[PDB]
Design a protein around this nucleic acid. Structure first.
Ligand SMILES: [Mg+2]
Ligand SMILES: [Mg+2]
Ligand SMILES: [Mg+2]
Ligand SMILES: [Mg+2]
Ligand SMILES: [Mg+2]
Ligand SMILES: [Mg+2]
Ligand SMILES: [Mg+2]
Length: 112
RNA sequence: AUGGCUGUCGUCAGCUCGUGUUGUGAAAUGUUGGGUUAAGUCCCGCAACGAGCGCAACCCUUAUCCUUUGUUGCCAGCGGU
Protein backbone atom coordinates (compact mmCIF):
# COMPACT_ATOMS: atom_id res chain seq x y z
CA UNK A 1 0.00 0.00 0.00
CA UNK A 2 0.95 3.68 0.11
CA UNK A 3 3.65 3.19 2.74
CA UNK A 4 5.14 6.29 1.16
CA UNK A 5 2.74 8.83 -0.23
CA UNK A 6 5.21 11.45 -1.54
CA UNK A 7 5.86 10.55 -5.21
CA UNK A 8 4.57 12.73 -8.05
CA UNK A 9 6.50 12.99 -11.33
CA UNK A 10 7.53 15.75 -13.69
CA UNK A 11 5.67 17.81 -16.23
CA UNK A 12 3.98 16.05 -19.11
CA UNK A 13 6.08 17.66 -21.83
CA UNK A 14 9.21 15.96 -20.63
CA UNK A 15 8.08 12.44 -20.19
CA UNK A 16 9.85 9.53 -21.70
CA UNK A 17 7.33 7.41 -23.67
CA UNK A 18 8.85 4.14 -22.45
CA UNK A 19 7.68 5.09 -18.93
CA UNK A 20 4.01 4.68 -19.94
CA UNK A 21 3.17 1.56 -17.86
CA UNK A 22 4.37 3.24 -14.64
CA UNK A 23 2.46 6.51 -15.16
CA UNK A 24 -0.94 7.15 -13.58
CA UNK A 25 -1.19 10.72 -14.85
CA UNK A 26 -3.77 13.43 -14.18
CA UNK A 27 -3.76 16.81 -12.48
CA UNK A 28 -2.26 20.12 -13.57
CA UNK A 29 -0.62 18.58 -16.66
CA UNK A 30 1.92 16.92 -14.35
CA UNK A 31 2.44 13.16 -14.42
CA UNK A 32 1.94 11.18 -11.22
CA UNK A 33 3.51 7.78 -10.61
CA UNK A 34 1.45 4.64 -10.01
CA UNK A 35 2.30 3.89 -6.39
CA UNK A 36 0.33 0.64 -6.63
CA UNK A 37 2.99 -0.41 -9.17
CA UNK A 38 6.09 0.91 -7.39
CA UNK A 39 5.55 -0.89 -4.08
CA UNK A 40 5.99 -4.48 -5.39
CA UNK A 41 9.03 -3.35 -7.36
CA UNK A 42 10.54 -1.44 -4.43
CA UNK A 43 9.99 -4.46 -2.18
CA UNK A 44 11.68 -6.80 -4.67
CA UNK A 45 14.61 -4.40 -5.01
CA UNK A 46 15.01 -4.29 -1.23
CA UNK A 47 14.90 -8.09 -1.11
CA UNK A 48 17.62 -8.37 -3.75
CA UNK A 49 19.80 -5.80 -1.98
CA UNK A 50 19.41 -7.75 1.26
CA UNK A 51 20.63 -10.92 -0.47
CA UNK A 52 23.60 -8.94 -1.79
CA UNK A 53 24.23 -7.73 1.76
CA UNK A 54 24.17 -11.33 3.00
CA UNK A 55 26.93 -12.09 0.49
CA UNK A 56 28.72 -9.07 2.05
CA UNK A 57 29.30 -6.93 -1.02
CA UNK A 58 29.55 -3.23 -1.77
CA UNK A 59 26.57 -1.22 -3.00
CA UNK A 60 28.12 2.19 -3.72
CA UNK A 61 25.37 4.78 -3.32
CA UNK A 62 25.31 7.41 -6.08
CA UNK A 63 23.61 10.72 -5.29
CA UNK A 64 25.62 13.36 -7.12
CA UNK A 65 22.70 15.71 -7.78
CA UNK A 66 22.44 18.74 -5.48
CA UNK A 67 19.28 17.48 -3.80
CA UNK A 68 20.51 14.48 -1.77
CA UNK A 69 24.24 15.16 -1.45
CA UNK A 70 24.15 15.16 2.35
CA UNK A 71 21.28 12.68 2.20
CA UNK A 72 23.83 10.29 0.68
CA UNK A 73 26.75 11.38 2.88
CA UNK A 74 24.89 10.64 6.11
CA UNK A 75 24.05 7.50 8.11
CA UNK A 76 23.37 6.18 4.61
CA UNK A 77 27.13 5.53 4.95
CA UNK A 78 26.69 4.22 8.51
CA UNK A 79 26.80 0.51 7.69
CA UNK A 80 28.97 -1.37 5.19
CA UNK A 81 28.78 0.70 2.00
CA UNK A 82 30.39 3.50 0.02
CA UNK A 83 29.06 6.51 -1.84
CA UNK A 84 29.65 9.03 -4.63
CA UNK A 85 28.34 12.43 -3.68
CA UNK A 86 29.78 14.90 -6.11
CA UNK A 87 30.67 14.75 -9.79
CA UNK A 88 30.88 11.24 -11.08
CA UNK A 89 34.31 11.12 -12.71
CA UNK A 90 34.00 9.54 -16.13
CA UNK A 91 35.36 6.01 -16.06
CA UNK A 92 35.56 5.66 -12.28
CA UNK A 93 34.77 1.97 -12.87
CA UNK A 94 35.68 1.22 -16.49
CA UNK A 95 39.32 2.19 -15.83
CA UNK A 96 39.63 1.54 -12.12
CA UNK A 97 43.40 1.22 -12.55
CA UNK A 98 43.91 4.93 -13.24
CA UNK A 99 41.51 6.14 -10.55
CA UNK A 100 43.17 3.71 -8.13
CA UNK A 101 46.26 5.93 -8.34
CA UNK A 102 44.31 9.02 -7.27
CA UNK A 103 42.99 7.09 -4.26
CA UNK A 104 46.55 6.16 -3.28
CA UNK A 105 47.55 9.81 -3.57
CA UNK A 106 44.59 10.81 -1.39
CA UNK A 107 45.55 8.27 1.28
CA UNK A 108 49.15 9.47 1.28
CA UNK A 109 48.07 13.08 1.83
CA UNK A 110 45.67 12.11 4.63
CA UNK A 111 48.52 10.46 6.53
CA UNK A 112 50.88 13.24 5.44
C1' A B 1 74.17 7.51 -48.84
C1' U B 2 75.83 9.32 -43.54
C1' G B 3 77.69 10.51 -37.94
C1' G B 4 78.87 14.79 -35.37
C1' C B 5 78.07 20.00 -35.23
C1' U B 6 75.13 24.44 -36.78
C1' G B 7 71.23 28.12 -38.81
C1' U B 8 65.92 28.85 -39.08
C1' C B 9 60.46 29.36 -37.96
C1' G B 10 61.22 30.85 -32.45
C1' U B 11 62.42 31.61 -26.16
C1' C B 12 56.94 31.26 -30.32
C1' A B 13 53.59 28.32 -26.43
C1' G B 14 52.81 24.79 -27.95
C1' C B 15 53.66 18.99 -28.99
C1' U B 16 52.24 14.25 -27.32
C1' C B 17 51.21 9.58 -24.75
C1' G B 18 48.68 5.32 -21.28
C1' U B 19 43.81 3.80 -19.77
C1' G B 20 38.80 4.90 -20.42
C1' U B 21 34.78 6.50 -23.60
C1' U B 22 32.49 7.98 -28.72
C1' G B 23 32.65 6.58 -34.23
C1' U B 24 32.42 0.75 -39.09
C1' G B 25 36.49 3.95 -40.12
C1' A B 26 40.20 7.73 -41.07
C1' A B 27 39.82 9.90 -36.13
C1' A B 28 37.75 12.46 -31.73
C1' U B 29 37.80 13.52 -26.36
C1' G B 30 41.43 14.89 -22.82
C1' U B 31 44.14 19.85 -25.13
C1' U B 32 37.22 22.29 -25.66
C1' G B 33 33.97 26.21 -22.43
C1' G B 34 33.71 30.88 -18.24
C1' G B 35 37.51 34.00 -16.15
C1' U B 36 42.95 35.02 -15.84
C1' U B 37 48.20 35.09 -17.17
C1' A B 38 54.24 36.61 -20.14
C1' A B 39 52.94 31.43 -20.44
C1' G B 40 48.54 24.38 -22.24
C1' U B 41 50.08 30.19 -16.03
C1' C B 42 46.26 29.18 -12.57
C1' C B 43 40.95 28.48 -10.74
C1' C B 44 35.94 26.72 -11.96
C1' G B 45 33.08 23.64 -15.07
C1' C B 46 33.26 19.23 -17.97
C1' A B 47 33.43 11.42 -20.42
C1' A B 48 37.23 12.02 -18.98
C1' C B 49 41.08 10.16 -15.45
C1' G B 50 46.46 10.65 -15.23
C1' A B 51 51.35 11.40 -17.23
C1' G B 52 55.62 13.30 -20.28
C1' C B 53 58.47 17.01 -23.24
C1' G B 54 57.89 22.25 -23.22
C1' C B 55 56.46 27.39 -19.51
C1' A B 56 57.98 28.70 -14.47
C1' A B 57 61.74 27.45 -10.66
C1' C B 58 66.79 25.29 -9.54
C1' C B 59 72.31 28.30 -12.54
C1' C B 60 75.55 33.01 -13.45
C1' U B 61 75.76 38.33 -12.98
C1' U B 62 73.91 43.18 -11.10
C1' A B 63 71.07 46.43 -7.08
C1' U B 64 70.79 46.70 -0.24
C1' C B 65 72.58 44.80 4.39
C1' C B 66 75.23 41.41 8.03
C1' U B 67 79.55 37.92 9.76
C1' U B 68 84.60 36.66 8.49
C1' U B 69 89.62 37.92 6.72
C1' G B 70 92.92 42.29 6.09
C1' U B 71 97.89 42.47 1.91
C1' U B 72 100.01 43.86 -2.58
C1' G B 73 94.03 46.88 -0.93
C1' C B 74 92.11 51.07 2.73
C1' C B 75 93.10 55.85 6.10
C1' A B 76 87.97 57.82 10.29
C1' G B 77 90.29 58.76 15.15
C1' C B 78 95.81 59.54 17.28
C1' G B 79 102.54 61.49 16.39
C1' G B 80 105.74 64.12 13.86
C1' U B 81 106.89 64.08 9.26
MG1 LIG C 1 35.03 1.49 -30.74
MG1 LIG D 1 47.28 21.49 -29.56
MG1 LIG E 1 42.82 16.77 -30.32
MG1 LIG F 1 40.45 28.66 -21.83
MG1 LIG G 1 52.24 23.24 -17.98
MG1 LIG H 1 39.85 20.85 -19.23
MG1 LIG I 1 98.51 63.44 10.38
Amino acid sequence: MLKAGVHFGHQTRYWNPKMKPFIFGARNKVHIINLEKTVPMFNEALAELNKIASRKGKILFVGTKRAASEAVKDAALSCDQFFVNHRWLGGMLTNWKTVRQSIKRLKDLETQ
